[PDB]
Design a protein around this ligand. Structure first.
Ligand SMILES: Nc1nc2c(c(CN[C@H]3C=C[C@H](O)[C@@H]3O)cn2[C@@H]2O[C@H](CO)[C@@H](O)[C@H]2O)c(=O)[nH]1
Length: 323
């Protein structure tokens, strides 16, 4: 199997044992048949709302972007004005960085990031309501800058160069060096490995560089889905993920689910395998996509679900460590 990060191997043990979540392989077959019938294809890379520049500064942009790419929910809803449009969620994040960099804030400079304060980021992300975990995003941007400065001469380009066109080796280099990116958990006393933000970071570089230079990777097939909260919401909507009663009610009542709890780990593990079972079934029906592509394609559908879909699971992302 390969699986040199062990995301598939460890998460497969969760899916086999899982009590609150299961895959409906009949629904997988139906959806594969339909997505393959209209030979569907993923979004390219939405380079309207992503900042653009030279090799060194752009590679740093991607690392910063995915360093604070998490948890956008809470009331009142966090919205952002940018260039005549109002944005929320992940698109509010990317617009907020484009705006800032365009107003001349050096978010690609290690020295600036290492020193960046609560006040700075409060303003970078200012708008309707406030971005969740404002302080934690400040700490992570400081942590990101210091590591860039010390270990990679302020250039994420150096870290990427070291990977040698291996997506899998880059994720390893990232999690080894940047504590914020260490996305693992336990389930019934076993380590489960996810590497959500670390893995998406690799996919974003492939997008931003059109699979050339710093975005060149020979093993993108090895990436898994990026297990957060939108893709499972879509897989449930498509009938591929089923939730048992107590968990279905929590999600419907918009009750927060403690991070690293069995129910939370079950949803993320099932999201990885939900996407993988869909990739295999699409491949069987003559439509070969990589796992990250099926994830990109599903996250895409998540932007336009009908109102009255089961709400996404709400987890206060934790990393309150590195002391
Ligand atoms: N799993 C997953 N997550 C995605 C995305 C995206 C956007 N991906 C773009 C990349 C290529 C296409 O243009 C897609 O629109 C943001 N995010 C955000 O990244 C985090 C990890 O899921 C969450 O905060 C999401 O809101 C995705 O495709 N898959």
């Amino acid at each position: 199997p390969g699986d040199r990060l062990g995301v598939l191997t460890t998460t497969r043990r969760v899916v086999e044992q899982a009590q609150a979540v299961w895959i409906d392989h009949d629904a997988v077959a139906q959806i594969a048949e339909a997505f393959a019938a209209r030979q569907v294809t993923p979004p390219t890379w939405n380079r309207e709302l992503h900042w653009s520049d030279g090799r060194e500064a752009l590679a740093n942009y991607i690392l910063v972007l995915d360093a604070v790419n998490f948890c956008f929910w809470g009331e009142p809803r966090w919205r952002i004005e940018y260039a005549g449009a109002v944005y929320d969620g992940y698109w509010a994040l990317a617009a907020s960085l484009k705006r800032a960099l365009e107003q001349g804030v050096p978010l690609t400079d290690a020295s600036y990031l290492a020193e960046i304060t609560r006040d700075d980021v409060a303003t970078i992300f200012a708008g309707e309501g406030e971005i969740p975990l404002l302080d934690e995003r400040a700490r992570i941007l400081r942590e990101t800058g210091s590591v860039l400065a010390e270990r990679f001469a302020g250039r994420f380009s150096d870290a990427i160069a070291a990977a040698g066109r291996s997506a899998v080796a880059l994720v390893d280099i990232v999690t080894n060096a940047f504590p914020s990116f260490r996305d693992v958990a336990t389930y019934r006393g076993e380590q489960v490995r996810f590497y959500c933000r670390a893995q998406i970071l690799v996919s974003d570089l492939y997008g931003a560089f059109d699979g050339s230079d710093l975005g060149a990777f020979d093993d993108l097939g090895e990436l898994t889905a990026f297990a957060d909260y939108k893709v499972p919401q879509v897989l449930h909507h498509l009938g591929i993920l089923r939730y048992a009663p107590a968990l279905h009610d929590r999600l419907a009542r918009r009750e927060e689910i403690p991070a690293g709890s069995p129910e939370e780990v079950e949803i993320r593990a099932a999201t990885i395998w939900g996407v993988e079972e869909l990739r295999r079934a699409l491949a069987s029906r003559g439509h070969a996509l990589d796992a990250y592509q099926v994830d990109w394609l599903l996250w895409d559908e998540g932007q336009r679900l009908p109102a009255g879909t089961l709400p996404y699971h709400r987890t206060r992302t934790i990393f309150y460590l590195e002391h």
